[PDB]
Design a protein around this ligand. Structure first.
Ligand code: NAG
Ligand code: NAG
Lengths: 537, 537
């Protein structure tokens, strides 16, 4: 049997055969505590280390996930499509909940310590679990250790009063704790604590980026030369600079919740103490909605974990030199457009104007809006066929995609390479059409996930039920190789050459069935939001 | 010897051998009167027909050109570069002047042939058809070529805003030449029902303006074809540009009247006063308009020009001619030439100044702040935003696009829209002179020597460039397109790389270079800025 001794006790994993000939087996350690349960007085408090246990602890089944409610209005626009498309399956992964949810899962392959890829999930900061992301194939195919983590979500993980009463960022601190646990225990599993790659998609991608800006991710016990906890980062369709990356009005929504559950909101210490006497179910189940493209509960600017606005930090180059790799998908903004399209696959010029105008209002309140609505309306029309209704959606979809994902990604990519971090950029332009998605839709938000995890190798799963072709399998194998090569050496080419990114040339890898390296991804539309729109104010 | 009988008498031309083996000889009839001298009481009056002569009139030397002053200064930005580059040679063509200058030149090769009437023009102020030798074009193409001299500057376009001086005398002269041609060219072996008019620059403007005038309607030969001429080619010139037509004619008529001592309350007295003065005195007065506008030119008289060409075009008020338009890569050379430093680049400093003054001259604030920023963004290549060699290339494009390209596309669009067989091109080659920078591309008027077939003869006093073997080949191709178009209204058919018909939807055009290809939507990104965005602002 597979036994492993850790600094808190011995644990037993479980061997797992994969449904493919090319793939060797993996031992998976499910439900490994990396922190003390954040219950009672430790709610709204930094994570403490886990209690040691005397005997052998079985790590063979998922632990209950962190409190969340996806069955009872959720922001489809932030959430991956494969998530919202089959919530029924996703729900079975989230049924068993508990405030005691700080657990991570290890996937170990089968003559030196292996790289460790720690996955950080995330949709809107409100929900999800690392359990959804099976790390078996990636570990086996890549010959690396893969870890998935569960961190505090929503209220419990990010509620803040704007005071020392509740400073917030408990979720990010949990991630820090999981990374420290990993740093100081993964070696016992045959992992290399000095080649740890952190990677995540969506809000998970945001979390990855936010950590690189935090001084809590500085320093590791093993090396005086390498002062990072983790050494590399991959942020997939997520950044720290988007409108919904961090919560800017945390005290507002903390008051709201406290009110809704009947707690006095005058004194902040009294407010917090009251919330702590209430079930997590009651706090989670309250209806708290922010602005359309903003969040209520998430990462906050506390002057500690996150010392300042991520924008300012990046500009001042306030981050350790990590090997970075970030990118976006062709059509992230599917769910922004999906409700608008009619029986034929197009949107009228009428609906177009409404959508673009409301977009301007939500993200750019008039101080001057008139000018802006026209500049954008112009920029996101293809005059080649200005009356085509099928082309109007593709470009409207591009508006959301560019502003919410692409421009933030490029800005991030630019500033990292600018300050000396080996940066790599990509554009994911393939996917596997499900019977739940339109036939005209391209690579949407989160569609790159199943390729990174190697799902096509195993074939359709309950979570990813698409009929993966042979092209899907090959593309997946290519992706996993880039990722894992990057994990092994900080170079996606060293275990089509993926060239290093730089602000001048802005070379990136266009990922498709025919992967090529291009240059200046959508710079025309990008520089609009980074150079023009700001100067108009 | 070559004798020809016309409705006004017999005339003797002169045979001319061309300096190329492939070219047969041509008989050229130089100094043929097509109208009575507009002298004395016929100054500021429509052109009357020429007097008949009993004997043989020798047409073997150029007649004196229309009054003009380039020696005493010259709007370099409107004028072709080959013009301003060697004024010494150009001057020899303009030395001998006379108000009696309504003469045209015939070039006959060796059924009835097509007739190509060339309409010269720089700023409406100067020039002559004599500069444009039509020998090679006629010989190579096997068509008759005509060059015309029409009234210029004050004498040709002065208007008081009254019936006292209605203006457009120059345009009426062109009409007179065309009527003369229609009713006499048959005697030379020409086809009065296959007359093509073509011109570059202001000449191009003149071509376009004629298509909007009802005076070019009706011919004596056919009841089905309602046009005097049947086809039109407008090279780097339109009726929609800022300097195509004079909108403040009365202002500048008074200015002149003032300088010569004729400023009178009553316009009929004013005109009568100007009529008692030498043409030299009127031509030599210093009258300069706004930076990108004209003082003396085509005017909106409600007769010859029934309304603003823009309105006319939009309402489709024009006969359906076979149309052909295009521009050169870098028309706006002379806009930028003064700015470049020893290195072939312009600083970010000078750039902002040049662009801002451009905004002020063409778009005086009534809102300018927004506009200068929108433009500054659109005309910078963010690929390398700091490159000084690239800053000039894009600033040059600003002028080029606004003054030439956008007016051309708009014209091209509205013509094809209302049913005229339209054709579009972009001229991307030239022959670098020791007078032009080595970094300059196809500038204003650089397509002329290729249209006239000069590379076939080799360097001339006017076109002294060392034409290569490729130049000769490209010229043959250009002349073939032009002459095919004259013959059949189709640049692909001589009788009775395929250049595809243009249309507002597909907007196919011929990219003319050493490797001529058909592309689509020429600089539509930059065009639609001026046609769709800035207006709505
Ligand atoms: C732990 O699990 C293994 C297999 O998963 C099993 O053999 C063992 O008996 C379990 N231990 C306990 C104490 O239940
Ligand atoms: C025209 O030229 C002929 C010879 O070609 C000559 O006899 C005649 O005198 C000339 N005409 C005039 C008006 O000089």
């Amino acid at each position: 049997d597979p036994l492993v001794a850790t600094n808190f006790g011995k644990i037993r994993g479980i061997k797992k055969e994969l449904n493919n000939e090319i793939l060797g087996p993996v031992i998976q350690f499910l439900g490994v505590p990396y922190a003390a349960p954040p219950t009672g007085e430790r709610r709204f408090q930094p994570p403490e280390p886990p209690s040691p246990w005397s005997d052998i602890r079985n790590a063979t089944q998922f632990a209950p996930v962190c409190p969340q409610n996806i069955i009872d209005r959720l922001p489809e626009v932030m959430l991956p499509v494969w998530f919202t498309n089959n919530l029924d399956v996703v729900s079975s992964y989230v049924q068993d909940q508990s405030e005691d949810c700080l657990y991570l899962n290890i996937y170990v392959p089968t003559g030196g310590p292996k790289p460790v890829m720690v996955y950080i999930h995330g949709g809107s900061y409100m929900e999800g679990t690392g359990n959804l992301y099976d790390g078996s194939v990636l570990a086996s195919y890549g010959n690396v250790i893969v870890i998935t983590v569960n961190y505090r979500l929503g209220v419990l993980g990010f509620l803040s009063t704007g005071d020392q009463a509740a400073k917030g960022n408990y979720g990010l601190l949990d991630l820090i704790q999981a990374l420290r646990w990993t740093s100081e225990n993964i070696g016992f599993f045959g992992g290399d604590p000095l080649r740890i790659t952190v990677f995540g998609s969506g809000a998970g991608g945001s979390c990855v980026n936010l950590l690189t800006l935090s001084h809590y991710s500085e320093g590791n016990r093993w090396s005086n030369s390498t002062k990072g906890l983790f050494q590399r980062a991959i942020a997939q369709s997520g950044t720290a600079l988007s409108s919904w990356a961090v919560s800017f009005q945390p005290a507002k929504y903390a008051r709201m919740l406290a009110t809704k559950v009947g707690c006095n909101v005058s004194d902040t210490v009294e407010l917090v103490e009251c919330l702590q006497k209430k079930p997590y179910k009651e706090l989670v189940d309250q209806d708290i909605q922010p602005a359309r493209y903003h969040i209520a509960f998430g990462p906050v600017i506390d002057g500690d974990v996150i010392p300042d606005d991520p924008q300012i930090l990046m500009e001042q180059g306030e981050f350790l030199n990590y090997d970075i790799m970030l990118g976006v998908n062709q059509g992230e903004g599917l769910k922004f457009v999906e409700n608008i399209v009619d029986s034929d696959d197009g949107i009228s010029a009428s609906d177009f104007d409404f959508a673009v105008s409301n977009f301007v209002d939500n993200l750019y309140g008039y101080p001057g809006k008139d000018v802006l609505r026209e500049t954008i309306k112009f920029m996101y029309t293809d005059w080649a066929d200005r009356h085509n209704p099928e082309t109007r959606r593709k470009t409207l979809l591009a508006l959301f995609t560019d502003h919410q994902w692409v421009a933030p990604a490029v800005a991030t990519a630019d500033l990292h390479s600018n300050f000396g971090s080996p940066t790599y950029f990509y554009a994911f332009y393939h996917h596997c059409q499900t019977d739940q998605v339109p036939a005209w839709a391209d690579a949407a938000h989160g569609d790159e996930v199943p390729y990174v995890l190697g799902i096509p190798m195993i074939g359709p799963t309950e979570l990813f039920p698409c009929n993966f072709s042979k092209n899907d399998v090959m593309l997946s194998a290519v992706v996993m190789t880039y990722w894992t090569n990057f994990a092994k050496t900080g170079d996606p080419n060293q275990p089509v050459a993926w060239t290093r990114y730089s602000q001048k040339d802005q070379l990136y890898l266009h990922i498709g069935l025919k992967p090529r390296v291009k240059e200046h991804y959508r710079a025309n539309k990008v520089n609009l939001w980074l150079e023009l729109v700001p100067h108009l104010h």
